[PDB]
Amino acid sequence: NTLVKQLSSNFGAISSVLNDILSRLDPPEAEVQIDRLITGRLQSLQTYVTQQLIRAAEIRASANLAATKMSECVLGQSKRVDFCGKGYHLMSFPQSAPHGVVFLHVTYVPAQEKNFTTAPAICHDGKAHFPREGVFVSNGTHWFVTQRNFYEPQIITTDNTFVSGNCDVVIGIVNNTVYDPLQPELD
Amino acid sequence: DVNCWRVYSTGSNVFQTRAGCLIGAEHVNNSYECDIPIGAGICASYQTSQSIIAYTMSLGAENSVAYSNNSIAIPTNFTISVTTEILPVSMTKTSVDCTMYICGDSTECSNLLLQYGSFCT
Amino acid sequence: AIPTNFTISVTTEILPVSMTKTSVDCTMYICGDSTECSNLLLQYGSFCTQLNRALTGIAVEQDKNTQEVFAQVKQIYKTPPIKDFGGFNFSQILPDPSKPSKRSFIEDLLFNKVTLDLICAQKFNGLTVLPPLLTDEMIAQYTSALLAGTITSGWTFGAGAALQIPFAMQMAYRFNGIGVTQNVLYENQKLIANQFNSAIGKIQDSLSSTASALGKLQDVVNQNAQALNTLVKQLSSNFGAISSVLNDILSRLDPPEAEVQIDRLITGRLQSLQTYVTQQLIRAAEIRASANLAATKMSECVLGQSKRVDFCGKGYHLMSFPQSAPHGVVFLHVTYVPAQEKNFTTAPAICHDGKAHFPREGVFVSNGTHWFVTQRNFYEPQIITTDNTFVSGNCDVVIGIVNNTVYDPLQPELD
Ligand SMILES: *[C@@H]1O[C@H](CO)[C@@H](O[C@@H]2O[C@H](CO)[C@@H](O)[C@H](O)[C@H]2NC(C)=O)[C@H](O)[C@H]1NC(C)=O
Ligand SMILES: *[C@@H]1O[C@H](CO)[C@@H](O[C@@H]2O[C@H](CO)[C@@H](O)[C@H](O)[C@H]2NC(C)=O)[C@H](O)[C@H]1NC(C)=O
Ligand SMILES: *[C@@H]1O[C@H](CO)[C@@H](O[C@@H]2O[C@H](CO)[C@@H](O)[C@H](O)[C@H]2NC(C)=O)[C@H](O)[C@H]1NC(C)=O
Ligand SMILES: *[C@@H]1O[C@H](CO)[C@@H](O[C@@H]2O[C@H](CO)[C@@H](O)[C@H](O)[C@H]2NC(C)=O)[C@H](O)[C@H]1NC(C)=O
Ligand SMILES: *[C@@H]1O[C@H](CO)[C@@H](O[C@@H]2O[C@H](CO)[C@@H](O)[C@H](O)[C@H]2NC(C)=O)[C@H](O)[C@H]1NC(C)=O
Ligand SMILES: *[C@@H]1O[C@H](CO)[C@@H](O[C@@H]2O[C@H](CO)[C@@H](O)[C@H](O)[C@H]2NC(C)=O)[C@H](O)[C@H]1NC(C)=O
Ligand SMILES: *[C@@H]1O[C@H](CO)[C@@H](O[C@@H]2O[C@H](CO)[C@@H](O)[C@H](O)[C@H]2NC(C)=O)[C@H](O)[C@H]1NC(C)=O
Ligand SMILES: *[C@@H]1O[C@H](CO)[C@@H](O[C@@H]2O[C@H](CO)[C@@H](O)[C@H](O)[C@H]2NC(C)=O)[C@H](O)[C@H]1NC(C)=O
Ligand SMILES: *[C@@H]1O[C@H](CO)[C@@H](O)[C@H](O)[C@H]1NC(C)=O
Ligand SMILES: *[C@@H]1O[C@H](CO)[C@@H](O)[C@H](O)[C@H]1NC(C)=O
Ligand SMILES: *[C@@H]1O[C@H](CO)[C@@H](O)[C@H](O)[C@H]1NC(C)=O
Ligand SMILES: *[C@@H]1O[C@H](CO)[C@@H](O)[C@H](O)[C@H]1NC(C)=O
Ligand SMILES: *[C@@H]1O[C@H](CO)[C@@H](O)[C@H](O)[C@H]1NC(C)=O
């Protein structure tokens, strides 16, 4: 729109209509007026061309980001944080909008939480047991081992922990017992 | 860029900001999320009689996690959330022509425009 | 070759996020207080409307860059009064409770090393510098909340509701992310602390010394000052007219002969303004790209543990801490680096009784006479058993399989 408005400008000439200038002026004095009009319109066109060239770079950067999101969020499961939504990414759906794309991200969010007393390791018989994959917790009287991102208490056994060293160098190790789920069967 | 004087016409409720002089807004001590950014940590909004208020925008609710050296928090329930994200990919394709724009149907204009070598190319 | 010792290294990374916001005015720049100049300037349709629109767009984008970078937490967390982090000492980056401006010591060192009448002369020609939306007292609060969230809740606060956890246990959760077992940390915890603090001690002594690290953050200020100085200097040019000052021309010339001189001055100053506008429009894109990169680094390096190589520092990434510098951000990356290595002879598998045993997770090594199984990124020899390897096929198709025996830790107990 602004470009079109630049046709309604004198730029120093007698009038802004080229046919008007050519109709009532002979060539020798019409040439300078026409030259003024030409240089004004040439500048008005160059400004628009430069603005479009600058805007195309931003559009290209956004298109590249959208292509990356389609490649990674949609065609796989991403582990980058806050890239494919808020939370833990599960999957995504693409949708099309006029001159653009819309991503529907499905995410997993923990809702309710509870306090527990934790411990790094367990000393059984002068040996320190560490969780294979999980964390030790306690409801006040007994100790359980559970996964990090969800609550699922389990009995501490030897097929679930691993030993390393003696209970002298760990900072917050505590007394407890370990099941060793093979003694009763042999009897 | 006015100290509040340099104001032509003033009125009631003149409030001084680091960004300048504000007339027509009532100052309060409350703090809400920014609605209209005045600047320099000052925001303005329209609320309830009805008036326009200016305040120092806040950042969010403040809490302290119950941190202890032998205490942990474990979740027990989960929630599935679906969110949307919009992204532009392309714009409209336009083309312009000098000979129709700068000169139109005229002929004497083209001869003068030819003196500029390769601008329109 | 297997490493036997490790080292904690803390490095710094500077990133510009935003620049200064400025606005210019044609009516004051090209013509000043004159009126006959404005009447002639009206013959150019809308050259000034777009020139004043582009600068407004840049100014409104500059306040969005910072909002994208820092504003990523909905709750302003606070560190607990009791500082019990298992030996790690964060007092060099935690906010000072004494000085009126609640900024940590390293933030003060960063602020003192950047040098932000020249200003009055620029302002007298219709050039103004708008104030930013977020003052430093709010950016400091944002970084303090970000830093107090990671040391008391881990990565959990970036994906929902913050859940507290002892620091010495998340420092093991993070070791499991790079391929080292838990018991390495718990048996070396003190040493690791005595390393980490020392690394912090070498950061400030590198910022308080005669070094040029914030120069990448100072070139931004230098370019913006240089452009304004050149724009102001462009007013002292003839451009072909008799005089370079407009009041003199209006004083000693009648309108019919003054109009052409005024037109020459107007076109010269119009070109001088358009060049500056184009340069600023080009520079804003680079600033925007840097701001996006900084926002990505904050999202991934800080609010989680990254596995991309050479993204959050050199080495194996453990954690990061943010700090605020004038018109930019500084990241302190903590990384794990193996230190002392030793040679060993390796083998793909072990043939026991016509069966080939492969390591469940690890590698076979030997000290010359016996064979052990150890983790890849640290040296910890163990006895080869059946609860530690898995069988597949017979020892005929593997290239470099060797004779050995496997414990099978169940025979002696049955006796
Ligand atoms: C902690 O968990 C243990 C195990 O679930 C609880 O002990 C059980 O409590 C129920 C309720 O009376 C009894 O019927 C079971 O016999 C108990 N089991 C054992 C092995 O003693 C214990 O009550 C829980 N403590 C708290 C405070 O909730
Ligand atoms: C775990 O239990 C053992 C014994 O079953 C504790 O070892 C004894 O602890 C007492 C009290 O601290 C000392 O007086 C003894 O000298 C220890 N050794 C013995 C009896 O041989 C061990 O301290 C417990 N672990 C803890 C408390 O963390
Ligand atoms: C705005 O103007 C007022 C009036 O000139 C300034 O107030 C004066 O400040 C000087 C500085 O020491 C004092 O000596 C005068 O006694 C003050 N006069 C009054 C009436 O207050 C004020 O400082 C100016 N604002 C700023 C930001 O400088
Ligand atoms: C976990 O959350 C879900 C929903 O947030 C709970 O399911 C709701 O249970 C109540 C009563 O038990 C019903 O009135 C709702 O309609 C249920 N929601 C849905 C979506 O069906 C569920 O009980 C929670 N689990 C625990 C252990 O608290
Ligand atoms: C692993 O490296 C650390 C430090 O790089 C070693 O600890 C040093 O030990 C010497 C003598 O034993 C002391 O003088 C130093 O003060 C220790 N460093 C620190 C930071 O306390 C450690 O001995 C190395 N481990 C092995 C097995 O070689
Ligand atoms: C953590 O680091 C701070 C900062 O260096 C230590 O505070 C210093 O303590 C020494 C005493 O050994 C004083 O001479 C310094 O003046 C203190 N510096 C500051 C800035 O207060 C602190 O001791 C370290 N340890 C702990 C547990 O906080
Ligand atoms: C390779 O490791 C084995 C196992 O640690 C070493 O064998 C032990 O050597 C010590 C030192 O004399 C003896 O006290 C043990 O009785 C040996 N154990 C067995 C099972 O024989 C062996 O010496 C090491 N070889 C080298 C070259 O370091
Ligand atoms: C592992 O040991 C077995 C026997 O315990 C080897 O099998 C014999 O190897 C010898 C020497 O190469 C041959 O002469 C025999 O014909 C093999 N078979 C038998 C004795 O039944 C086996 O080669 C060893 N693995 C190696 C060397 O990689
Ligand atoms: C855990 O204990 C703290 C300390 O009193 C308390 O503020 C918090 O509410 C507790 N957690 C839950 C889920 O109630
Ligand atoms: C936790 O802190 C208490 C002091 O409040 C101390 O008695 C205890 O030993 C500490 N335990 C660990 C594992 O840090
Ligand atoms: C805001 O609070 C201050 C001190 O708490 C008080 O002096 C002032 O009057 C309050 N604002 C208004 C509008 O009353
Ligand atoms: C491993 O052996 C090579 C070959 O001689 C030697 O150059 C290298 O120094 C050895 N490794 C170490 C840690 O000494
Ligand atoms: C390694 O190379 C040597 C030759 O130097 C060869 O005798 C041996 O069989 C090779 N072993 C493997 C496992 O490639």
Numbering used by the authors:
A (entry chain C): 960 to 1146
B (entry chain C): 614 to 617, 633 to 676, 689 to 761
C (entry chain B): 713 to 828, 848 to 1146
Give the authors' words.
Encoded by a single viral gene, the mature spike glycoprotein comprises two subunits, S1 and S2, which mediate binding to the receptor and facilitate fusion, respectively. Here we show that the NTD of SARS-CoV-2 spike binds biliverdin with high affinity.
Next, we imaged single particles of the trimeric SARS-CoV-2 spike ectodomain in the presence of excess biliverdin using cryo-EM. Biliverdin levels in plasma of healthy individuals (0.9 to 6.9 μM) and more so under pathological conditions (>50 μM) greatly exceed the Kd of its interaction with the spike (~10 nM) and are therefore sufficient to impinge on SARS-CoV-2 antigenic properties and neutralization.
